[PDB]
Symmetry: D2
Subunit: 23 residues, 4 copies
């Protein structure tokens, strides 16, 4: 989990920014 946090947080952030573009 510790080694995957940064990668998975970045993926969560990328999806969050994409959702905001649809608005």
């Amino acid at each position: 989990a510790d080694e995957x946090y940064k990668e998975x947080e970045d993926x969560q952030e990328r999806x969050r920014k994409x959702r905001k573009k649809x608005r």
Copy 2:
């Protein structure tokens, strides 16, 4: 609507990642 179905799918993908992450964190 295509845009509405896209928006709902993106919201569902965000939630799928949240649940995957919650499972890895716990534990």
Copy 3:
């Protein structure tokens, strides 16, 4: 890796289907 394969394969497939919808 063994325990995450099914989850990550499903995520890869979901993105693949979404890309196909844009066509």
Copy 4:
């Protein structure tokens, strides 16, 4: 174009997952 930038972003997300998975598999 919005649709073109969306398509490119989705292609890039697919690739980001492929590279993440390749890193976990190797090893």
